Amino acid sequence: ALNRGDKVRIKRTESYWYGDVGTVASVEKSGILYPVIVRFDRVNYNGFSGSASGVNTNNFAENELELVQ
Amino acid sequence: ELSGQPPKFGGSTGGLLSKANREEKYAITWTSASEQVFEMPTGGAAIMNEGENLLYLARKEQCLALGTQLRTKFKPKIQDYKIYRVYPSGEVQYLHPADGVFPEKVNEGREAQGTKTRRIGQNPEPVTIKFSGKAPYEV
Amino acid sequence: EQWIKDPLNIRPIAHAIWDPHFGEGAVNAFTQAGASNPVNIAYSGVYHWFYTIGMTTNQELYSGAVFLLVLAS
Amino acid sequence: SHSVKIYDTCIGCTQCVRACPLDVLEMVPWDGCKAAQIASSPRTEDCVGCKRCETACPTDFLSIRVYLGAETTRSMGLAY
Amino acid sequence: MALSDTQILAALVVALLPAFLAFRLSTELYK
Amino acid sequence: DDFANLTPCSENPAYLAKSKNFLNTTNDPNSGKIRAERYASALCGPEGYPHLIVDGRFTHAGDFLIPSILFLYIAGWIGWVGRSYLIEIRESKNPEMQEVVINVPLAIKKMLGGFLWPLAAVGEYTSGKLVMKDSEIPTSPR
Amino acid sequence: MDGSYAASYLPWILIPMVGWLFPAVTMGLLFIHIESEGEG
Amino acid sequence: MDGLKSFLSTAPVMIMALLTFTAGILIEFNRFYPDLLFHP
Amino acid sequence: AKVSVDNNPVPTSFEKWGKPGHFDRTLARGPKTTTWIWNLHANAHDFDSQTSDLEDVSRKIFSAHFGHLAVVFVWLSGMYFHGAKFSNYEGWLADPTHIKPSAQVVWPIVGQGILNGDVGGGFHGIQITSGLFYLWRASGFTDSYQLYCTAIGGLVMAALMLFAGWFHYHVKAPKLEWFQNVESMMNHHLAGLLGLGSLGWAGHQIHVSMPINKLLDAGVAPKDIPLPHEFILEPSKMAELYPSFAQGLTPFFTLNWGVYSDFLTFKGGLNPVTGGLWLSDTAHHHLAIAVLFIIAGHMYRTNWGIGHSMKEILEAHKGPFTGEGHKGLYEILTTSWHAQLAINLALLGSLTIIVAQHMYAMPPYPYQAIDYATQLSLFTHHMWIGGFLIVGAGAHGAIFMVRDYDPAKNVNNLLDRMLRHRDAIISHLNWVCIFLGFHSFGLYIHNDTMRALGRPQDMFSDTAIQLQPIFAQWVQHLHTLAPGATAPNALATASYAFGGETIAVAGKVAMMPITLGTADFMVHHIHAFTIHVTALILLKGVLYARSSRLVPDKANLGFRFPCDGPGRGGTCQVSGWDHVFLGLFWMYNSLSIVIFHFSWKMQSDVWGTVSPDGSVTHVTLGNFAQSAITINGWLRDFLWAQAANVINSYGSALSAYGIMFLAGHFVFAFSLMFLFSGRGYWQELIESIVWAHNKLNVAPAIQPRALSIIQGRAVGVAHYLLGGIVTTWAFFLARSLSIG
Numbered sequence A: 001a002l003n004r005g006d007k008v009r010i011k012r013t014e015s016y017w018y019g020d021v022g023t024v025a026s027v028e029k030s031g032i033l034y035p036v037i038v039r040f041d042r043v044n045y046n047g048f049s050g051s052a053s054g055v056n057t058n059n060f061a062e063n064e065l066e067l068v069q
Numbered sequence B: 001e002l003s004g005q006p007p008k009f010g011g012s013t014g015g016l017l018s019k020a021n022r023e024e025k026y027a028i029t030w031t032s033a034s035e036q037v038f039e040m041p042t043g044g045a046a047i048m049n050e051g052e053n054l055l056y057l058a059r060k061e062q063c064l065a066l067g068t069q070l071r072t073k074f075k076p077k078i079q080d081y082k083i084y085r086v087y088p089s090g091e092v093q094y095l096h097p098a099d100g101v102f103p104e105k106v107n108e109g110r111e112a113q114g115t116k117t118r119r120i121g122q123n124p125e126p127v128t129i130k131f132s133g134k135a136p137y138e139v
Numbered sequence C: 001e002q003w004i005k006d007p008l009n010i011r012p013i014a015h016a017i018w019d020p021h022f023g024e025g026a027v028n029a030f031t032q033a034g035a036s037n038p039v040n041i042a043y044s045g046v047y048h049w050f051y052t053i054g055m056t057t058n059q060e061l062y063s064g065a066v067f068l069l070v071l072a073s
Numbered sequence D: 001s002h003s004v005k006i007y008d009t010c011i012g013c014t015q016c017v018r019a020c021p022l023d024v025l026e027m028v029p030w031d032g033c034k035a036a037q038i039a040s041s042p043r044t045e046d047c048v049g050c051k052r053c054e055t056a057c058p059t060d061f062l063s064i065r066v067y068l069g070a071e072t073t074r075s076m077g078l079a080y
Numbered sequence E: 001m002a003l004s005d006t007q008i009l010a011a012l013v014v015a016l017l018p019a020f021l022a023f024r025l026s027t028e029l030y031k
Numbered sequence F: 001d002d003f004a005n006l007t008p009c010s011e012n013p014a015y016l017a018k019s020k021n022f023l024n025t026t027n028d029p030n031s032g033k034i035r036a037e038r039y040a041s042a043l044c045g046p047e048g049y050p051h052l053i054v055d056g057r058f059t060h061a062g063d064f065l066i067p068s069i070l071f072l073y074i075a076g077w078i079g080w081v082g083r084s085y086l087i088e089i090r091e092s093k094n095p096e097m098q099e100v101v102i103n104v105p106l107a108i109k110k111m112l113g114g115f116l117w118p119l120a121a122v123g124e125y126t127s128g129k130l131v132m133k134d135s136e137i138p139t140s141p142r
Numbered sequence G: 001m002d003g004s005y006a007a008s009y010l011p012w013i014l015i016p017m018v019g020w021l022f023p024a025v026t027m028g029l030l031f032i033h034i035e036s037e038g039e040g
Numbered sequence H: 001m002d003g004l005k006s007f008l009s010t011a012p013v014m015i016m017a018l019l020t021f022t023a024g025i026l027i028e029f030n031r032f033y034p035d036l037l038f039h040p
Numbered sequence I: 001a002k003v004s005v006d007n008n009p010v011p012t013s014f015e016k017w018g019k020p021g022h023f024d025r026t027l028a029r030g031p032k033t034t035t036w037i038w039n040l041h042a043n044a045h046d047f048d049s050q051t052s053d054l055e056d057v058s059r060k061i062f063s064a065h066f067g068h069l070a071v072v073f074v075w076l077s078g079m080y081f082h083g084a085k086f087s088n089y090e091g092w093l094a095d096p097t098h099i100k101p102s103a104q105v106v107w108p109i110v111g112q113g114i115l116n117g118d119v120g121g122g123f124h125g126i127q128i129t130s131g132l133f134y135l136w137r138a139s140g141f142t143d144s145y146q147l148y149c150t151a152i153g154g155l156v157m158a159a160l161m162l163f164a165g166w167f168h169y170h171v172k173a174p175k176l177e178w179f180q181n182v183e184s185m186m187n188h189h190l191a192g193l194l195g196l197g198s199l200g201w202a203g204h205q206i207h208v209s210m211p212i213n214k215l216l217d218a219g220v221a222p223k224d225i226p227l228p229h230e231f232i233l234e235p236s237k238m239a240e241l242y243p244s245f246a247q248g249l250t251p252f253f254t255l256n257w258g259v260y261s262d263f264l265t266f267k268g269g270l271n272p273v274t275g276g277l278w279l280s281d282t283a284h285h286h287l288a289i290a291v292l293f294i295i296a297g298h299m300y301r302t303n304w305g306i307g308h309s310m311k312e313i314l315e316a317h318k319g320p321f322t323g324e325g326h327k328g329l330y331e332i333l334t335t336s337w338h339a340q341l342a343i344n345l346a347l348l349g350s351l352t353i354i355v356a357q358h359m360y361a362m363p364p365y366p367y368q369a370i371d372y373a374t375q376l377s378l379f380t381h382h383m384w385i386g387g388f389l390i391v392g393a394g395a396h397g398a399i400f401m402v403r404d405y406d407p408a409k410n411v412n413n414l415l416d417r418m419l420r421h422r423d424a425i426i427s428h429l430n431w432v433c434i435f436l437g438f439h440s441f442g443l444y445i446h447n448d449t450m451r452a453l454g455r456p457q458d459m460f461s462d463t464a465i466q467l468q469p470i471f472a473q474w475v476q477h478l479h480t481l482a483p484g485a486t487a488p489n490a491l492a493t494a495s496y497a498f499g500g501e502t503i504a505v506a507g508k509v510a511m512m513p514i515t516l517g518t519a520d521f522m523v524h525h526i527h528a529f530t531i532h533v534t535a536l537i538l539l540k541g542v543l544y545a546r547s548s549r550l551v552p553d554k555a556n557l558g559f560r561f562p563c564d565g566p567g568r569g570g571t572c573q574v575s576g577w578d579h580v581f582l583g584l585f586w587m588y589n590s591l592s593i594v595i596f597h598f599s600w601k602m603q604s605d606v607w608g609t610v611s612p613d614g615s616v617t618h619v620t621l622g623n624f625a626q627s628a629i630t631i632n633g634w635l636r637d638f639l640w641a642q643a644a645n646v647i648n649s650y651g652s653a654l655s656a657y658g659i660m661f662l663a664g665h666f667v668f669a670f671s672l673m674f675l676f677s678g679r680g681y682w683q684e685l686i687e688s689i690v691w692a693h694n695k696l697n698v699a700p701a702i703q704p705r706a707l708s709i710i711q712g713r714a715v716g717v718a719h720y721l722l723g724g725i726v727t728t729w730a731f732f733l734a735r736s737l738s739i740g
């Protein structure tokens, strides 16, 4: 359902982007239980104390994403 | 049992204490291709001799730090070190590597431990498990 | 019993002082409020409370203390 | 000793095992991720609780969590 | 009038009772 | 009969006694006299210093109301130009780079358009895109 | 250190016990209890 | 030069230039009209 | 010639000015969070981490040092210009005992014109406490035009320094071999810089300063005194002032030096007219040290095989207890800039401490001893500079140990042996710190309790149990007898602090004997305790930076990391940077006690007014002896009593100081925001505020982040030290300007 370039809202309820919007960078079609890959403009808190950047990509299941586009 | 010429060291105050003869100590053994200088985790520099080596340390973390230094800071990389736990009675327990393959790479025959079939957000609420000797992650 | 005779000019006393580490100067300084020994000066305002609620004699205070001992037991 | 748990959001990047200084973690075969491997904590009695494995985890929230518990000589990392 | 020595000693003896009761309560609570 | 404890500075003996020796704030030699004149119309306390009354009354509107309006206009100007510049640069390809290196042309273009910030703000609120919905904002777990 | 209250000799003996004897006895008992290995 | 223009447009330079502009405005106004406690 | 350079290595362009963070690979990518800003201002001047080539690092260091020289030159030129245009130096020169120095004038805008107090002579301005006027009078300045020309020359020198940096980096960059000519550098910098500088200053003094100051001290008006070039043009005046100048330079070349005895003396002591040192004594002094430094040159082999070799000397001094001895240190100090920085910082900080402690006992400048404010300001200022430099040595040594230390080149040498018995060193040092603190501060607390309990006869005082500094008294006695006995050709003592008569100028005591008693014993041993504790902290930082029993791999974690984790019971503040952060506070404590002791003792036992009869009335009377033995005495007779002049400063010319006093008391407290808290709380608060700004669609692209743990600690310590030092500065300046 979710393809490349899809703007989706995150509903994992514990990820850094809960309620934020991201874009679907890739979807892997197999038995993987978190197949969707979503990338975001903002970066999370990931990194050692003093790092100047975080992580702007994550893996999500299909059910925890709401299509917006 | 445990064989190897100890590296030539002048002795330092950072070595073992009474815990070694009272609780336990740790031993690290490796094969060196040349007598060369390396760094004691307890402070100072000592030369290790060609062939077998054997070193007694007080903590497993010190042994693994020495193993990391051996693996990273030498062009003829030393990947054959072995870390044992030596008890005061005399028992020697093989610790690292567990099955002979480094834990970084996946090897068949290992058993999953501490793996939960849910995600971090699906843990039970504490109020539903209170007055029992359990924690949300323990469930 | 002396305080009630002049509440506006007498300092209430909290408890007596017994300190072997004291010196002569401290002993002279802390002998206050008309006492015959080093004493402290009460600042919890219990003298006014006891006076207002009707306690006027030492024996009444003693009976109250014993009764409170019994109540705590 | 402390407890180490690995949740099903692991992608098998093996960074946690590399970051562990006391060799507590291991890489075991799996099927839930593309790398088909998941982290494990067999030697959990040697863990000190430095949280280096948690720092190394790149998921949105840590797929590996460390819960500090009972303290032993090993857990305190004492040399005496 | 100021108290007497017998009054102070009697107060000590009376207070000896809550001490014993408090010891019993502490032992009961520890159990 | 309001402020029976506050007297006019024009008659308060302390203020008149102390206003002769008012210090000169600037290089002008009679700045102290000007200050004494300007403060003689206020409400001085027993110690002779002016007091500002802020209760809504328009007789003392100069104490709070006029500076309040001035500050509100200026602060709204600043906030509106900042928000407009932020929203404008947010559609570019490197919004963060333009945050540290200011786009001075666009910056000044937004700088000069801020004097109509109340009309723009009310039009923004009526258009509905001044305030985002609660479901479109990232939120922390409860 | 000398008082004019009734039974002024009591602080001469009560304070040392509260000062030395009781604290020392309590220190010893607690130290033995918290250090008694086993049985719990 | 383009590089000089870009350097002049950086955050500290803009913030300090605006601060000196505002400070000069305030100082000149207070010089020519001092001691303004209220709109009289 | 050993010169080797590279031509046009780095083009001169403006493009990289428009891309901040270009030096760092992690920052040149572009900011995503606010931390990118704080890193940019923090990793800028750390050239070692930016690149791995040592030659590029050395070139950058050379040009950066040129830049700091240019900045200092601009500062000096500004000082001279502001002393030439906005100062009463010409007025003060005619009446030095009745006019206060002043070189800062305040514009009247919002009532700050009250700061322009009456400094005497009809001049209104801020009184200065740097002592520049006395230095200028000693240098022979008499007109403001000379000061203006000095300022112009300083600006020209600053521009020349800037051009030198640009040339020696962007055009002709020296090679690595050039930088490692430590023998040539040491020769040229001992003989060509220190020796030649001393010779030039001795020539200036003899040919300029002494005649002008001799005429000035006699009573001649400044305008009547001939200009300095007229003495050279017409040596008749010079021969008139000093007869031996009639003999010319013949006795110098014939070793008949004694004839020059009139203007090259060995008097010692103070000049009665001005209260400063004799300029003839200073002339022979700087001449002698010039000769000594030029002789100390020509020592290291550079190009003609005639000289010592540093490596040979280092590798030759080895003994039984030290294994390889001083082997490998030459490669350490010729390949790592950080070790050189550590050694130089330690020695330089101790040098400014020596400067502070020696410039007050023998005041070298005319009319400086009687200006108590200038004395206190100079002492405290250079004291603080020395303390900061020593802490910086303790820091950059640990930086070297983490980064540039290599175990391969250090086997059984002194560094390795140090790394081997480090536990014994730290344990014995910790014990001595505990012993010193216990016994000394317990003397203080014991005195407090004895005084509070009404038993003054059980105290530690001169009337009570004595505790006299017998060794210091003995050395004072020896130095008082030195003229005539052990220094036969000296006329007076080195200083009157040891003993002698009371030198007083203009009815104000310039220098009188400083007696040491029980209080001096206690305070000196308190100083020893504080210094040993600070040394303990910095030594633990340096020695244990590589590893420890708790964390055996701290070297791989870096030099500046907050912690290892909550494991092992908690591993907070284990890096060397954390040891520096902890040692900064103890340096502050020790130096605060030092300056407090100096101020109180100076006010109570030396400074004051002398009557025509000869009696001396001190600033705070003789209250130091009987009050400085209890902490209550320090709190009541020093802080509360002497803070009156700074709390009552409102409404007068000193009001600014009062304001600044409160300012300090604020910032210190403000620092407790960062030292007492952590960053997770602030991160969650920022999360809520970010939600707020997001509701209105005004969220910033650069995501705001709470400060890092290391940044939080650094901000806390910086604001703390700033507040405390500003408080002490305001208090000292107000008190010293309010005591006449």
Ligand code: CLA
Pocket (backbone or CB within 6 Å): C015, C016, C017, C018, C019, C020, C021, C026, C040, G015, G018, G019, G022, G023, G026, G027, I449, I452, I453
């Ligand atoms: C060396 C210093 C020193 C010492 C040892 C004392 C000793 C004493 N002073 Mg004293 N005093 C001193 C200096 C000193 N003073 C000075 C300099 C002054 C100022 C001039 C005074 C002014 C002063 C006054 C005005 C009074 C005293 C009083 C007393 C007595 C109080 C009795 C007591 O402590 O039991 C009570 C003990 C406690 C309350 C213990 C509290 C401390 C612990 C840490 C709290 C408990 C924590 C924890 C729960 C402990 C667990 C249990 C433990 C066993 C593990 C005691 C003899 C009083 C007195 O004589 O009345 C009897 C009194 O009124 N003193």
Ligand code: CLA
Pocket (backbone or CB within 6 Å): C015, C016, C017, C018, E008, E011, E012, E015, G010, G011, G012, G014, G015, G018
């Ligand atoms: C909690 C209440 C309390 C407190 C704080 C004090 C405080 C004091 N009493 Mg005191 N006293 C109290 C109740 C109290 N009294 C009662 C109820 C009695 C009647 C039995 C007495 C009878 C008494 C005598 C006869 C004397 C004192 C003396 C003193 C002083 C010496 C220190 C001391 O207590 O040891 C000595 C006193 C005792 C050991 C009395 C026993 C303590 C009471 C009875 C029990 C209190 C238990 C308490 C609640 C435990 C709390 C636990 C908590 C800390 C965790 C001191 C000022 C001495 C004095 O005047 O010195 C100048 C003295 O000679 N007291």
Ligand code: CLA
Pocket (backbone or CB within 6 Å): H017, H020, I074, I075, I077, I078, I079, I081, I082, I086, I104, I105, I106, I107
């Ligand atoms: C350490 C060096 C130093 C220091 C601390 C001072 C300090 C002072 N000088 Mg001074 N001065 C110095 C060196 C120094 N001077 C030198 C070397 C000269 C010789 C050229 C002078 C010549 C001089 C004169 C002639 C005067 C002073 C005055 C003053 C006082 C008023 C402050 C002032 O000028 O700001 C005034 C305010 C400003 C300069 C603000 C203007 C805006 C600034 C420059 C913002 C900077 C950015 C700007 C927008 C340009 C962009 C650049 C960008 C591309 C990087 C003050 C006590 C004045 C004084 O005491 O009068 C009684 C005065 O008249 N100075």
Ligand code: CLA
Pocket (backbone or CB within 6 Å): I061, I062, I063, I065, I066, I069, I178, I179, I181, I182, I184, I185, I186, I188, I189, I191, I192, I193
């Ligand atoms: C006589 C020769 C001579 C002299 C005077 C100096 C002087 C200096 N060197 Mg140096 N050096 C020399 C030879 C010399 N060097 C040689 C041969 C080498 C190669 C082995 C080096 C390599 C070297 C390095 C690698 C560094 C220095 C640095 C420095 C400066 C340290 C800062 C200081 O002392 O503050 C005191 C400052 C002053 C007294 C101001 C002096 C201003 C100019 C430059 C002095 C010119 C004097 C010259 C003889 C003309 C005067 C004669 C006449 C007009 C009166 C200082 C100016 C450091 C630096 O970067 O500074 C630039 C540094 O890092 N030197």
Ligand code: CLA
Pocket (backbone or CB within 6 Å): I041, I042, I043, I044, I045, I046, I047, I048, I341, I388, I389, I390, I391, I392, I393, I395, I396, I399, I559, I560, I577, I580, I718
């Ligand atoms: C000759 C002096 C000297 C030199 C050349 C260096 C050189 C260096 N130091 Mg070092 N240092 C020194 C003295 C010196 N230090 C002293 C005396 C101390 C003790 C305080 C330190 C403590 C120190 C630490 C703790 C660290 C360095 C680091 C460094 C490296 C560059 C990073 C850096 O600090 O830049 C960046 C500089 C700053 C961000 C400073 C800006 C903030 C300052 C503190 C504000 C000052 C405010 C001012 C006093 C008053 C303003 C008031 C306000 C109201 C206007 C570099 C090798 C760092 C490193 O690891 O490099 C390898 C590092 O972590 N140094």
Ligand SMILES: CCCCCCCCCCCCCCCC(=O)OC[C@H](COP(=O)(O)OC[C@@H](O)CO)OC(=O)CCCCCCCCCCCCCCC
Pocket (backbone or CB within 6 Å): I317, I318, I319, I320, I321, I322, I325, I326
């Ligand atoms: C003056 C009175 C006031 C100060 C009194 C304090 C003195 C206390 C100790 C005595 C100093 C003895 C030095 C001899 C020691 C000595 O000269 O050693 C020299 C010896 C090296 O001997 P070698 O001849 O082998 O050395 C060859 C060297 O040239 C290295 O190449 O070093 C050692 O044996 C190890 C040093 C152990 C040092 C123990 C630590 C002592 C720390 C405390 C010192 C404190 C002094 C503080 C005040 C300055």
Ligand SMILES: CC1=C(/C=C/C(C)=C/C=C/C(C)=C\C=C\C=C(C)\C=C\C=C(C)\C=C\C2=C[C@H](C)[C@H](O)CC2(C)C)C(C)(C)C[C@@H](O)C1
Pocket (backbone or CB within 6 Å): F054, F055, F056, F064, F065, F075, F076, F077, F078, F079, F080, F081, F083, F117, F121, I696, I698
């Ligand atoms: C539009 C705008 C923005 C946004 C603005 C927003 C979203 C505003 C939202 C406001 C809300 C939600 C609520 C506001 C409440 C205001 C209240 C309660 C005002 C009360 C006033 C009182 C009580 C007046 C009191 C007395 C009034 C009287 C005149 C005297 O003095 C005496 C005195 C002081 C008692 C920014 C911030 C993004 C940028 C700005 O430039 C423009």
Ligand code: SF4
Pocket (backbone or CB within 6 Å): D004, D019, D020, D021, D022, D023, D024, D025, D046, D047, D048, D049, D050, D051, D052, D053, D054, D066, I567
């Ligand atoms: S907390 Fe540290 S020791 Fe424990 S598993 Fe993680 S990395 Fe290993």
Ligand code: SF4
Pocket (backbone or CB within 6 Å): D006, D009, D010, D011, D012, D013, D014, D015, D016, D017, D038, D039, D053, D056, D057, D058, D059, D062, D063, D064
């Ligand atoms: S770091 Fe995280 S994602 Fe990577 S292997 Fe370990 S638990 Fe899995």
